Amino acid sequence: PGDQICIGYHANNSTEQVDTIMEKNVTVTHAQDILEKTHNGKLCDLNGVKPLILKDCSVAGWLLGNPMCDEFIRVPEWSYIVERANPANDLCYPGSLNDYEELKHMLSRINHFEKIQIIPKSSWPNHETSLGVSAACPYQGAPSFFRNVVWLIKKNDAYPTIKISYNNTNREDLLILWGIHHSNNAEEQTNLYKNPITYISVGTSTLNQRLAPKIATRSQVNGLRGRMDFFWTILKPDDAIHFESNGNFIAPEYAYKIVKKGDSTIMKSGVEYGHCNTKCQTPVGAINSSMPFHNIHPLTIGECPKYVKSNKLVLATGLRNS
Amino acid sequence: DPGDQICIGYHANNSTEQVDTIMEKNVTVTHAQDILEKTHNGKLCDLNGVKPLILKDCSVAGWLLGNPMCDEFIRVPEWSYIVERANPANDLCYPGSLNDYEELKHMLSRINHFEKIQIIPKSSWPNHETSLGVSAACPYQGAPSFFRNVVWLIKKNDAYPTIKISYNNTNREDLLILWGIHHSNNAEEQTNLYKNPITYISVGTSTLNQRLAPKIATRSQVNGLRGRMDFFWTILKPDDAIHFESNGNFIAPEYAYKIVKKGDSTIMKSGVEYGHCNTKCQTPVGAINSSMPFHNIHPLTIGECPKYVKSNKLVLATGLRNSP
Amino acid sequence: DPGDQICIGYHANNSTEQVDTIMEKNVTVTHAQDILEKTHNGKLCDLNGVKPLILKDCSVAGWLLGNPMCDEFIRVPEWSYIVERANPANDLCYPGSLNDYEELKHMLSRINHFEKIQIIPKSSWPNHETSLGVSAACPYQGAPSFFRNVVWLIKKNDAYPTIKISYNNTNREDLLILWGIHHSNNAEEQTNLYKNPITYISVGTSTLNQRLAPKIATRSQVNGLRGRMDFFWTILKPDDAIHFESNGNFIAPEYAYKIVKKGDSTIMKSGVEYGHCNTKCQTPVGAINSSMPFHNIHPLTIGECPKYVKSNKLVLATGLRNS
Amino acid sequence: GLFGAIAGFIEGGWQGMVDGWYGYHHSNEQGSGYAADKESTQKAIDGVTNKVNSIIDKMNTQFEAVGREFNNLERRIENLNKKMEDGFLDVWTYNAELLVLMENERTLDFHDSNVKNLYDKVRLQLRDNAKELGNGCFEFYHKCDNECMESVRNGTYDYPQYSEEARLKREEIS
Amino acid sequence: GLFGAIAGFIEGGWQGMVDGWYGYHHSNEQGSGYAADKESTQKAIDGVTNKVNSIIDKMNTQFEAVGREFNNLERRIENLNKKMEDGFLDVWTYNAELLVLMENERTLDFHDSNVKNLYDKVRLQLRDNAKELGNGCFEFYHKCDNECMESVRNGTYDYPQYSEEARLKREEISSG
Amino acid sequence: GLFGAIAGFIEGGWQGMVDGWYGYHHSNEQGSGYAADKESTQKAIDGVTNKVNSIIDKMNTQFEAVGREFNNLERRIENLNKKMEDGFLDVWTYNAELLVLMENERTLDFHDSNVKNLYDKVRLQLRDNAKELGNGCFEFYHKCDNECMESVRNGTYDYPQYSEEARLKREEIS
Ligand SMILES: CC(=O)N[C@H]1[C@H](O[C@@H]2[C@@H](O)[C@H](O)O[C@H](CO)[C@@H]2O)O[C@H](CO)[C@@H](O[C@@H]2O[C@H](CO[C@]3(C(=O)O)C[C@H](O)[C@@H](NC(C)=O)[C@H]([C@H](O)[C@H](O)CO)O3)[C@H](O)[C@H](O)[C@H]2O)[C@@H]1O
Ligand SMILES: CC(=O)N[C@H]1[C@H](O[C@@H]2[C@@H](O)[C@H](O)O[C@H](CO)[C@@H]2O)O[C@H](CO)[C@@H](O[C@@H]2O[C@H](CO[C@]3(C(=O)O)C[C@H](O)[C@@H](NC(C)=O)[C@H]([C@H](O)[C@H](O)CO)O3)[C@H](O)[C@H](O)[C@H]2O)[C@@H]1O
Ligand SMILES: *[C@@H]1O[C@H](CO)[C@@H](O[C@@H]2O[C@H](CO)[C@@H](O[C@@H]3O[C@H](CO)[C@@H](O)[C@H](O)[C@@H]3O)[C@H](O)[C@H]2NC(C)=O)[C@H](O)[C@H]1NC(C)=O
Ligand SMILES: *[C@@H]1O[C@H](CO)[C@@H](O[C@@H]2O[C@H](CO)[C@@H](O[C@@H]3O[C@H](CO)[C@@H](O)[C@H](O)[C@@H]3O)[C@H](O)[C@H]2NC(C)=O)[C@H](O)[C@H]1NC(C)=O
Ligand SMILES: *[C@@H]1O[C@H](CO)[C@@H](O[C@@H]2O[C@H](CO)[C@@H](O[C@@H]3O[C@H](CO)[C@@H](O)[C@H](O)[C@@H]3O)[C@H](O)[C@H]2NC(C)=O)[C@H](O)[C@H]1NC(C)=O
Ligand SMILES: *[C@@H]1O[C@H](CO)[C@@H](O[C@@H]2O[C@H](CO)[C@@H](O)[C@H](O)[C@H]2NC(C)=O)[C@H](O)[C@H]1NC(C)=O
Ligand SMILES: *[C@@H]1O[C@H](CO)[C@@H](O)[C@H](O)[C@H]1NC(C)=O
Ligand SMILES: *[C@@H]1O[C@H](CO)[C@@H](O)[C@H](O)[C@H]1NC(C)=O
Ligand SMILES: *[C@@H]1O[C@H](CO)[C@@H](O)[C@H](O)[C@H]1NC(C)=O
Ligand SMILES: *[C@@H]1O[C@H](CO)[C@@H](O)[C@H](O)[C@H]1NC(C)=O
Ligand SMILES: *[C@@H]1O[C@H](CO)[C@@H](O)[C@H](O)[C@H]1NC(C)=O
């Protein structure tokens, strides 16, 4: 006998196993895993724009010019902000920044950013401009203060009522920051500003703010019972901001031109910068796209796969192996 | 010799309809159905038989306070949603703000019954002037005016006696009451208007307990005005009383709104013209029919709508594979 | 011709259970299995071994401040979730408000350790009246009373000296401290109670810097009262001191709570009785013990629960067509 | 397809079959023509109708009011709504596409299954009394009148009626 | 009915057989009885068990506290929570209902192929020694006893052992 | 197992077949060897490639910035975000796992149907000129040389050429 023709199918030496709905651990000739599990372990540029990396400073310290942070650098643009989980450098003088979370969200991605001086120290001929200094903000071990703002003190035992204004002649939005100092007692209030009852008036086309110091006993933070509450606003072009105060005024000196075109968030990571580019950034590293799913980290920025709780997603492509 | 022949076969027609399967693309089929909604009528329609409130030239704040530059339309006792332009032409003729504006807008998005009534007529102010609270930034009928549902009280005969008034909600429905405070520009302006250098406003109900003081300072010019007026609101429940106390800078109510709210909606930002139509699903660019499980018109829909997807076609094969 | 016959066939039985396919409806099958959980025990249970904090008819505010109609001292030092009724009857006997009330309730939803301690004894006010701060709106057994955990300080001998008191958190645990301010009705009432026409409250910690002032104005009667009491709270972390300054209208704290929080939960609105049971998933109408992927009991669930769906049955065919 | 029929042993399908989805074509001494099998097409009509209705009707829709009611100092909350909206868009777009892709594969296989099953019913009735050309047709070993043509189509083909005459055409014809 | 066995040519289950989901029914001179194929039945029961377990075990459940913690001036936030909760209910409801509908179709067709696979197994062995009745049974052209029945039910039917014996009747049966 | 080919009447795969997924093994007077059916192998490759690409390309991805920007007095808001992120994770994890399980079952049966269809195409051509061995092989009743074997794999097998030889062989065993 003989002359036989047979029908059969391919088989190889593969050990790749896939799971089906009715059967588990089915060895197949070929298979592909559609789950991304690999990251480069480096913080990268997001679509060609480098992140703004704050080494040890929070956004509040970097914005207000904490003497332990650098005095601005070549950062005219960034795609996201990298913060440490607990930045050591923050508001050195204890206090607060109003709407700090909303301010950070706006500053997460900035198209254009440039510090300028809006009010020189020559604009205060009747107040002391160099005496606004504290030991809780030392620069070279010597007491100092926030670089971008001025702590005004009485001159000649007098604090004349301030009436100053700035017209935003720039063609871009301006970010202006100012503060109010909270005294500890009545005696300290007069020693610094000579005026017992004081106020701060801030006015723009949209802003109408009145601030008064809260003089009370408070626990020591960084050796200080005093507090300073800082505030911010966005001054539109050709608009003007008006400051009026008779004490406790932390007058702005520098301001930032803001051009915002997109949005991002704040990333909390200690991973270093790798001079790379990516479409998706996770706190532990960047991941290359084209897989529909991933399991690296939930707190991603960019066009990323869908984060799942799987360790393997293996699609079967070949035949069942013998 | 002729072997009789019986054959099996299937249907075919003249159809160019194409579907995509999981393993083949562009498969011609005899018949198919699309389960995706793609058409809108390009109009704003009534939602379940209730026409929306369409503020063509006004914001909600300006409409409520009675901005004289906003067009007056016939009273609308009920609406299913509120339509606003992206940038309303008139919002606040006198520069200022309305407190909790976003929440007030959301509450007023769907109102079962709305009716303006008079609570404090201008005849009820013997010791304060009621007709000079007027600005050129709020013209009405060729004359300087103000928000017409409130009254801007001014000193009379160089005197502003302290106001102590009360209103009891005798109606069976809730009442929306608005009032405000005027922020002066300097001490001279304050005395020229109210004669009292230091002024306050106290408002009290069974729940409300509010104290205001004018923030007298220098600001930028809006509509040619450096002053500001911040308005506030509350819902006066039936049989409760509201108590106003002030010695200056008080923007007293004159009209209030009997309000009945049963359902909830939002505010649609659109400029599409009203279409005198009814729908179960409204988009800012038009109404859709909402029979299919999916649609790709717009994400900001009001009503009972299909699931919004970013797709161009969802075509199901119903017939067989068609061959040429 | 009795040709021997071998046949091929399949099972059948008496089952009337029916499943639906994507192309056919009402198909009887020999075996079927439902993946929709539909049963609950109808009682409020412990959540993973921890009993819920059930407030019968008191709110979180009245329970915290010490409303006389509430429990004077709760036994639970630990709870998994708080059970409130839809409208608690005893919220604030004296009309007023509690600052950041909704966020405070979220924190207290699940508490690892909770113990009330006394931080300021009533003997700490030698020149103020500590026994006249009562009200008909806060009765205990008919007689006028007040919140048990705070002291309504009143002028003594027609004088209200400026108060300057402070407390250091010497404990090893965070302290929840509550205080308040009383809003007078008129100038004469302010004098009749505190003798100082213009008064203030200053509260200061390492993070808190608060200035309060009474709002003396005409208001509507609530519980027969036109006065109001606004209450506030803060978390005094260990080794930090709170500082109080006031010359009138001060509602001083007496008792505080040592609090340790290690998990999060929410407030459940229910009237269902406690069932002396344990569960990993709890609903306002009853706890469910299931491993099914879906349930249709209730949407407002606390715990590890299946996915709530709008379905009456999800029955899968685990057998063949019946006949 | 998945069973073999549409573009299988049958190549293109019949344009003259306008009375149904599946059917027969006979060719005897009396003439030729087309006919449809009512039971098979009706099941196919109901099956696809149920499939489309199930996909449409099983969707649950609720009233919602979707807008933008957060101000410039509530952008963090508006980001949360954006993430929620876009997340649901991704879920529904993905499911709708795959559901359409997969059920279309099922539907065409379902039509393929019906044609092959209709073939096997004819195949198991004619047996050795007819010979299969392998292209979707059968060659009778006897004479089949229009009455007997319906018998194949309507399930009443009597095997002994032509078994003897068949042998005189298959075995006898060498 | 995707493979045409369950209700295509078999046309009816057997209430008599209680041993398994699929099996055989022999009827010879010794008697009549029901046999169940333990091989395919065990595979089907194990296969359906995996499907049901996979539908159940793949659902990830985490601790969540669902409540209503927003007040009369936080309704916009509440609307966001409502849209989120309603959105997740719509997703799960659609998936769960359609998952059952699709898998119920596959499970029934899974049972349909198992019968045909058993049917095609017997058909190959007998070839011409037994005719195809069309009702899911094979009437042997030869004589087959209980031992011979076992060979068909475990895959050891010797065709040439009864070849010419079938032919003598086959060439005579068709003669009428 | 749905078609009883890959694990059924064909009990195993061929390691010697390396140029395709499905194919033929022949054994005639000129020798024995392997031949892969590229018409079936290419269509299977395109379909499997389309399925993997569809599972990948139909996913819609958008720019999102996922962080934690809510303070200690906004924990209700961040709990809303927690329920949103966890809910979407449950949706995607359940979808992804079941999508793999269902399609892996579908893909394996897709190969099963292709192998079965190859067997039926060869069987439909040989008819009674070959013997069905029930193991995936056909024993010819005639002499099928290398050119004849290619015709079977080319769908061009000529039945009338070997009819009398096959019938003589069938009678030769009688
Ligand atoms: C300006 C200054 O050094 N003031 C200290 C004060 O001296 C007073 C003197 O300025 C005035 O003319 O006359 C009165 C008597 O009538 C005082 O003699 O003396 C206090 C008690 O010795 C000091 O308090 C101490 O302050 C410490 C912090 O020092 C700094 C700081 O580093 O933050 C010193 C800075 O020069 C000063 N800033 C400015 C702009 O003048 C600040 C400032 O006073 C506070 O930050 C405001 O709250 O304080 C420690 O806090 C220490 O515990 C405390 O005893 C006065 O510093
Ligand atoms: C302290 C007191 O008894 N006040 C009531 C007032 O008595 C006057 C007295 O205070 C003053 O020294 O001398 C004059 C005569 O020269 C009066 O004898 O009389 C008013 C008129 O009836 C009362 O108004 C009523 O107050 C009610 C409130 O009851 C309580 C409460 O809510 O528990 C009673 C408490 O004794 C009282 N506590 C304190 C520390 O003063 C509080 C408190 O006054 C208010 O809660 C503050 O707003 O009030 C009802 O409100 C009732 O409707 C009202 O007519 C004075 O209470
Ligand atoms: C929702 O479905 C309805 C019903 O199918 C659609 O309404 C239909 O719209 C078409 C085109 O606008 C109308 O056709 C027109 O009819 C008039 C006669 O009335 C004729 O003069 C025109 O030339 C044209 O054929 C049709 O009448 C109308 N049907 C009904 C019942 O009113 C509607 O357009 C769908 N909605 C959307 C958003 O697509
Ligand atoms: C499959 O079997 C179910 C029973 O399990 C059938 O459901 C029944 O369908 C009838 C007619 O559609 C329903 O009557 C209708 O009920 C509603 C209220 O639910 C009423 O508004 C209508 O006027 C009418 O009386 C009946 O209630 C329903 N029963 C149940 C238990 O759901 C179903 O029709 C069967 N489907 C098919 C395709 O055969
Ligand atoms: C299924 O096919 C069979 C064929 O084997 C059909 O039996 C035949 O049915 C036709 C239809 O009525 C009968 O023809 C009729 O005959 C009488 C008398 O000659 C005449 O008056 C009528 O006008 C018509 O021509 C035919 O006799 C009958 N064959 C018999 C009785 O042997 C059967 O009806 C078919 N089933 C269905 C449901 O159509
Ligand atoms: C299915 O057909 C569509 C046309 O309906 C094809 O889409 C075309 O793709 C080419 C690619 O180069 C474009 O240049 C054409 O403009 C497209 N036409 C349209 C109308 O969109 C599509 O490519 C086809 N599918 C495949 C797999 O080839
Ligand atoms: C499948 O294989 C993996 C890897 O070896 C093993 O961990 C797992 O237990 C296996 N599962 C079963 C059901 O055999
Ligand atoms: C700023 O300067 C421009 C220059 O024309 C002027 O028009 C504008 O009013 C100024 N802004 C003020 C005064 O707020
Ligand atoms: C309003 O009038 C009713 C009429 O009986 C009265 O009972 C109620 O107390 C009044 N509300 C006040 C005074 O707030
Ligand atoms: C509380 O007492 C401790 C004891 O060492 C001290 O360190 C701490 O500063 C005190 N807290 C204050 C003063 O706020
Ligand atoms: C298939 O093989 C036959 C026999 O060798 C040959 O004649 C025919 O041309 C082939 N078909 C092709 C090459 O398309």
From TrEMBL, chain B:
In natural infection, inactive HA is matured into HA1 and HA2 outside the cell by one or more trypsin-like, arginine-specific endoprotease secreted by the bronchial epithelial cells. One identified protease that may be involved in this process is secreted in lungs by club cells. The keyword Protein transport does not apply. GO terms for biological process: clathrin-dependent endocytosis of virus by host cell; fusion of virus membrane with host endosome membrane; fusion of virus membrane with host plasma membrane; viral budding from plasma membrane; virion attachment to host cell. GO terms for cellular component: host cell plasma membrane; membrane; viral envelope; virion membrane. One of its GO terms (molecular function) is host cell surface receptor binding. It is a single-pass type I membrane protein. It is found in: Host apical cell membrane; Virion membrane. Signal peptide: none annotated. The keyword Cell inner membrane does not apply. Glycans are attached at N13, N14, N26, N168, N289. Its main location: host cell. Disulfide bonds join C45-C277, C58-C70, C93-C138, C281-C305. Keywords: Clathrin- and caveolin-independent endocytosis of virus by host, Clathrin-mediated endocytosis of virus by host, Coiled coil, Disulfide bond, Fusion of virus membrane with host endosomal membrane, Fusion of virus membrane with host membrane, Glycoprotein, Hemagglutinin, Host cell membrane, Host membrane, Host-virus interaction, Lipoprotein, Membrane, Palmitate, Signal, Transmembrane, Transmembrane helix, Viral attachment to host cell, Viral envelope protein, Viral penetration into host cytoplasm, Virion, Virus endocytosis by host, Virus entry into host cell. Binds to sialic acid-containing receptors on the cell surface, bringing about the attachment of the virus particle to the cell. This attachment induces virion internalization either through clathrin-dependent endocytosis or through clathrin- and caveolin-independent pathway. Plays a major role in the determination of host range restriction and virulence. Class I viral fusion protein. Responsible for penetration of the virus into the cell cytoplasm by mediating the fusion of the membrane of the endocytosed virus particle with the endosomal membrane. Binds to sialic acid-containing receptors on the cell surface, bringing about the attachment of the virus particle to the cell. This attachment induces virion internalization of about two third of the virus particles through clathrin-dependent endocytosis and about one third through a clathrin- and caveolin-independent pathway. Plays a major role in the determination of host range restriction and virulence. Class I viral fusion protein. Belongs to the influenza viruses hemagglutinin family. This is Hemagglutinin. It comes from Influenza A virus. The chain holds residues 17 to 337 of 567 of the full protein.
From TrEMBL, chains D, F:
It is found in: Host apical cell membrane; Virion membrane. Residues 56-90 form a coiled coil. Binds to sialic acid-containing receptors on the cell surface, bringing about the attachment of the virus particle to the cell. This attachment induces virion internalization of about two third of the virus particles through clathrin-dependent endocytosis and about one third through a clathrin- and caveolin-independent pathway. Plays a major role in the determination of host range restriction and virulence. Class I viral fusion protein. Homotrimer of disulfide-linked HA1-HA2. Belongs to the influenza viruses hemagglutinin family. This is Hemagglutinin. The chain holds residues 330 to 503 of 531 of the full protein.
